[PDB]
Write an enzyme that holds these catalytic residues in place. Structure first.
Site, PDB file in Angstrom:
ATOM      1  N   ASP A 285       0.862  -1.172   0.000  1.00  0.00           N
ATOM      2  CA  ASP A 285       0.000   0.000   0.000  1.00  0.00           C
ATOM      3  C   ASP A 285       0.912   1.240   0.000  1.00  0.00           C
ATOM      4  O   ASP A 285       2.150   1.121   0.025  1.00  0.00           O
ATOM      5  CB  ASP A 285      -0.971  -0.046   1.190  1.00  0.00           C
ATOM      6  CG  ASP A 285      -2.254   0.735   0.934  1.00  0.00           C
ATOM      7  OD1 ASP A 285      -2.239   1.696   0.113  1.00  0.00           O
ATOM      8  OD2 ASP A 285      -3.284   0.383   1.538  1.00  0.00           O
ATOM      9  N   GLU A 491     -10.690   6.505   4.274  1.00  0.00           N
ATOM     10  CA  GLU A 491      -9.624   6.002   5.157  1.00  0.00           C
ATOM     11  C   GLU A 491      -9.760   6.623   6.566  1.00  0.00           C
ATOM     12  O   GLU A 491     -10.889   6.687   7.085  1.00  0.00           O
ATOM     13  CB  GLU A 491      -8.225   6.163   4.513  1.00  0.00           C
ATOM     14  CG  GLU A 491      -8.057   5.283   3.273  1.00  0.00           C
ATOM     15  CD  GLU A 491      -6.758   5.517   2.508  1.00  0.00           C
ATOM     16  OE1 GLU A 491      -5.695   5.090   2.989  1.00  0.00           O
ATOM     17  OE2 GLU A 491      -6.809   6.080   1.391  1.00  0.00           O
TER      18      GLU A 491
HETATM   19  O1  LIG Z   1      -4.125   4.925  -3.668  1.00  0.00           O
HETATM   20  C1  LIG Z   1      -3.554   3.633  -3.650  1.00  0.00           C
HETATM   21  C2  LIG Z   1      -3.835   2.970  -2.302  1.00  0.00           C
HETATM   22  O2  LIG Z   1      -3.705   3.950  -1.275  1.00  0.00           O
HETATM   23  C3  LIG Z   1      -3.929   3.469   0.046  1.00  0.00           C
HETATM   24  O3  LIG Z   1      -3.773   4.479   1.028  1.00  0.00           O
HETATM   25  C4  LIG Z   1      -5.306   2.837   0.199  1.00  0.00           C
HETATM   26  O4  LIG Z   1      -5.309   2.233   1.470  1.00  0.00           O
HETATM   27  C5  LIG Z   1      -5.523   1.780  -0.879  1.00  0.00           C
HETATM   28  O5  LIG Z   1      -6.848   1.305  -0.825  1.00  0.00           O
HETATM   29  C6  LIG Z   1      -5.238   2.361  -2.261  1.00  0.00           C
HETATM   30  O6  LIG Z   1      -5.391   1.363  -3.256  1.00  0.00           O
END
Ligand SMILES: OC[C@H]1O[C@@H](O)[C@H](O)[C@@H](O)[C@@H]1O
Ligand SMILES: *[C@@H]1O[C@H](CO)[C@@H](O[C@@H]2O[C@H](CO)[C@@H](O[C@@H]3O[C@H](CO[C@H]4O[C@H](CO)[C@@H](O)[C@H](O)[C@@H]4O[C@@H]4O[C@H](CO)[C@@H](O)[C@H](O)[C@H]4NC(C)=O)[C@@H](O)[C@H](O)[C@@H]3O)[C@H](O)[C@H]2NC(C)=O)[C@H](O)[C@H]1NC(C)=O
Ligand SMILES: *[C@@H]1O[C@H](CO)[C@@H](O[C@@H]2O[C@H](CO)[C@@H](O[C@@H]3O[C@H](CO)[C@@H](O)[C@H](O)[C@@H]3O[C@@H]3OC[C@@H](O)[C@H](O)[C@H]3O)[C@H](O)[C@H]2NC(C)=O)[C@H](O[C@H]2O[C@@H](C)[C@@H](O)[C@@H](O)[C@@H]2O)[C@H]1NC(C)=O
Ligand SMILES: *[C@@H]1O[C@H](CO)[C@@H](O[C@@H]2O[C@H](CO)[C@@H](O[C@@H]3O[C@H](CO)[C@@H](O)[C@H](O)[C@@H]3O)[C@H](O)[C@H]2NC(C)=O)[C@H](O)[C@H]1NC(C)=O
Length: 602
Positions: A285, A491
């Site tokens: 991630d 988030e």
């Molecule tokens: O943007 C790319 C990634 O960023 C991360 O902070 C999120 O948790 C993911 O769900 C996402 O795919």
């Protein structure tokens, strides 16, 4: 002489091996490196042999950019990568998690929690199919979806990204994968990556594993559960994903019993790779490896060592690629990370690229640009929005006439509430901006617009965002539709210990329903404290985060279709009960998982 990896007629495994054997250390580490478009230039991509780019949330070429502008951007990056010695094309990734949602004019589908309410895996497959087309419309080949988290506490800011608290529902919805990628062959070996070709995209099962199980739904936190519970709740849908040929798996920020997922060799290598036989690539991630340490990024050398040894293949840096490449190179030069580990990571990345046809079609198809926001896709999103709605109440007493469906012909009706005419609110997070946004952020139809589009021409429609009680009592209204709920979040910004909707919301519902019979439409990413809203309302609908196609809401309100949605999560009486999931001892829901009133069409 003849160069086997460049020969499109040769088996993928042969092409992978042939290319791998030609690559320098820098070329190999470059493949393992994914960078943000915001830090990419032709020179950077060429000089560092970069293997992948992404747009993070809201990372766009321009506000309101056309599909062609996106294609031109992606192709400009691709031309740089194709100009390297070996000419390995880059793969470009994006969070297309409810349609191609960063892109202006893209169809925005209901978020996952609403899709769970449909109990319709074939609908979700069709959404994957439409989403692949709209992502390819922009030149992008890789979507970071599906999130197969099993959200076990709605206090989590990403609860809307989970189809259900019930892993069986999440498992059924892994049908998104062959939607996005294409159906796998009859002969298919579980765990192999698959993408059908240039009209499909690589998918990503995320976030491995137990992202939905964190203490108090604290985002990125600790999932405290024994192996049996991890394997019974949080793991099953990953096996379905293997069976359906998911091309990539993204690792979770969260920890399991105090061990960071990004540093967990037992789960990433021992389980995902060695037990499930996953043969695609594993991606971090965003700054996931940085967050292994406390503070985040305080020992980046360790972050690189721990994550790559754990078995991750591609690192979403996404900004500080110089530091990442330098550190990994030093670790390999010093024997701390063996070449076998690097070769494995690169093998997986190249396998996905060759498999999906990326070497044959590295550039965008300008004929695909018109797939973006295509009306057929909006019709699908509208179907999904309607199917996702859960009718919670339809009459205050057992002897009342049911309020819904509402008549399309009435002298005068009221549409009210902060969420009645707000496209950004009805879409929620991951829409245009990372956090979503307020107002008319893209192309779509608000609840108000949908009402005006649905009613008889003789019906006068009045909009008042927050009318007082007197306005309503004096207005001569036949009924009211009032829409309220959560603001967009994504988030950690979505983490919420109280789960009470912002005001004015309840006050508006009370003022409206006090004056005329009212249907309340609740827009939320999750169950929220709802007794006061129920008490005020004649009818109440949980509409979740229905996306750009607000006519899905009115399709059910006005009886064109019957309500069919059923709760994919427990509706709690109070947050002090949480966590509380179907199957628990002393399960005491306001509405149990699976609850939903129905109506009939017309
Ligand atoms: O943007 C790319 C990634 O960023 C991360 O902070 C999120 O948790 C993911 O769900 C996402 O795919
Ligand atoms: C239960 O717990 C939740 C989560 O912790 C709390 O919600 C959060 O509250 C804090 C403040 O205490 C807030 O942080 C501030 O945000 C300010 C800006 O806030 C507005 O914009 C953001 C988006 O940028 C929205 O997410 C917010 O909801 C606000 O939106 C505005 O809200 C008003 C009231 O409904 C509305 O009239 C406006 O139209 C609307 N505007 C927009 C753009 O939509 C910052 O300026 C400040 O510096 C703080 O950071 C945080 O944003 C809240 N989170 C969310 C997701 O809403 C609850 O307060 C809490 N409830 C109870 C009962 O205690
Ligand atoms: C008035 O509304 C009634 C309630 O919605 C409706 O009755 C339901 O009809 C649906 C089919 O349209 C039934 O769903 C099926 O249930 C089966 C299992 O019992 C499944 O094998 C089917 O796949 C289907 O399940 C649905 O699949 C899609 C998914 O997204 C849904 O979540 C899932 O339910 C449902 O069980 C009925 N409900 C009950 C308990 O009666 C009425 O239409 C139907 O009446 C039923 C009883 C049946 O005879 C149908 O032929 C008929 O269309 C509806 N009345 C009218 C006149 O339209
Ligand atoms: C799960 O979430 C909790 C709550 O956020 C995390 O605990 C918190 O961890 C941070 C550090 O990352 C602590 O902040 C630090 O506090 C110290 C001590 O005063 C201070 O010197 C630092 O400058 C920093 O601010 C925070 O205090 C702590 N909070 C609590 C309530 O314990 C926890 O680390 C998370 N766990 C996982 C596995 O992610």
């Amino acid at each position: 002489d003849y160069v086997l990896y460049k020969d499109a007629t040769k088996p993928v495994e042969d092409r992978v091996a042939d290319l791998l054997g030609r690559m320098t250390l820098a070329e190999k580490i470059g493949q393992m490196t994914q960078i943000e478009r915001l830090v990419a230039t032709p020179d950077v991509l060429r000089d560092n042999f970069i293997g992948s780019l992404l747009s993070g949330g809201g990372s766009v070429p321009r506000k309101g950019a056309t599909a062609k502008e996106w294609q031109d951007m992606v192709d400009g990056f691709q031309k740089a990568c194709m100009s390297t010695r070996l000419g390995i094309p880059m793969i470009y990734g994006i969070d297309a998690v409810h349609g191609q949602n960063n892109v202006y004019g893209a169809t925005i589908f209901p978020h996952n929690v609403g899709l769970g309410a449909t109990r319709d895996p074939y609908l979700v497959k069709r959404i994957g199919e439409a989403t692949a087309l709209e992502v390819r419309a922009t030149g992008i080949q890789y979507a970071f979806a599906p999130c197969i988290a099993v959200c076990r506490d709605p206090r989590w800011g990403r609860c809307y990204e989970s189809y259900s608290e019930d892993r069986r529902i999440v498992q059924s919805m892994t049908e998104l994968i062959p939607g996005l990628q294409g159906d796998v062959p009859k002969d298919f070996t579980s765990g192999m990556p698959f993408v059908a070709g240039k009209n499909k995209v690589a998918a990503c099962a995320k976030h491995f594993v137990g992202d939905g199980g964190t203490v108090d739904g604290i985002n990125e936190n600790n999932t405290i559960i024994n192996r049996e519970g991890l394997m019974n709740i949080h793991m099953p849908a990953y096996k379905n994903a293997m069976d359906k040929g998911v091309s990539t798996v993204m690792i979770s920020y969260s920890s399991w019993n105090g061990v960071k997922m990004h540093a967990n060799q037992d789960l990433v290598t021992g389980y995902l790779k060695d037990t499930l036989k996953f043969k695609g690539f594993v991606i971090s991630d965003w700054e996931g490896i940085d967050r292994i340490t406390t503070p985040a990024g305080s020992d980046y050398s360790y972050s690189v060592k721990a994550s790559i040894l754990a078995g991750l293949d591609m690192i979403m840096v996404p900004n500080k690629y110089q530091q990442f490449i330098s550190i990994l190179t030093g670790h390999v030069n010093g024997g701390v990370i063996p070449m076998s580990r690097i070769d494995d990571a690169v093998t997986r990345i190249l396998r996905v690229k060759f498999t999906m046809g990326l070497f044959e079609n590295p550039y965008a198809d300008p004929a695909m640009a018109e797939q973006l926001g295509k009306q057929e896709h909006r019709d699908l999103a509208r179907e999904a929005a309607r199917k996702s709605l859960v009718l919670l109440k339809n009459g205050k007493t057992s002897t009342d006439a049911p309020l819904l469906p509402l008549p399309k012909k009435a002298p005068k009706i009221l549409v009210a509430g902060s969420h009645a005419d707000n496209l950004g609110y009805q879409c929620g997070g991951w829409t245009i901006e990372w956090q979503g946004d307020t107002g008319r952020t893209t192309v779509g139809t608000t609840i108000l617009e949908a009402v005006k589009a649905a009613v008889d021409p003789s019906t006068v429609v009045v909009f008042a965002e927050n009318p007082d009680a007197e306005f309503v009592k004096s207005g001569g209204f036949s009924y009211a539709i009032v829409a309220v709920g959560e603001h967009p979040y994504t988030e950690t910004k979505g983490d919420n210990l109280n789960l009470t909707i912002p005001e004015p919301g309840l006050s508006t519902v009370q003022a409206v329903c006090g004056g005329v019979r009212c249907a309340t439409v609740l827009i939320s990413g999750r169950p929220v404290v709802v007794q006061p809203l129920l008490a005020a309302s004649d009818a109440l609908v949980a509409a979740w985060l229905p996306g750009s196609e607000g006519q899905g809401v009115t399709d059910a309100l006005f009886g064109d279709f019957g309500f069919t949605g059923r709760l994919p999560r427990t509706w709690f009486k109070s947050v002090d009960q949480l966590p509380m999931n179907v199957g628990d001892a002393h399960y005491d829901p306001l509405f149990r998982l699976g609850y939903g009133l129905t109506t009939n069409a017309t």
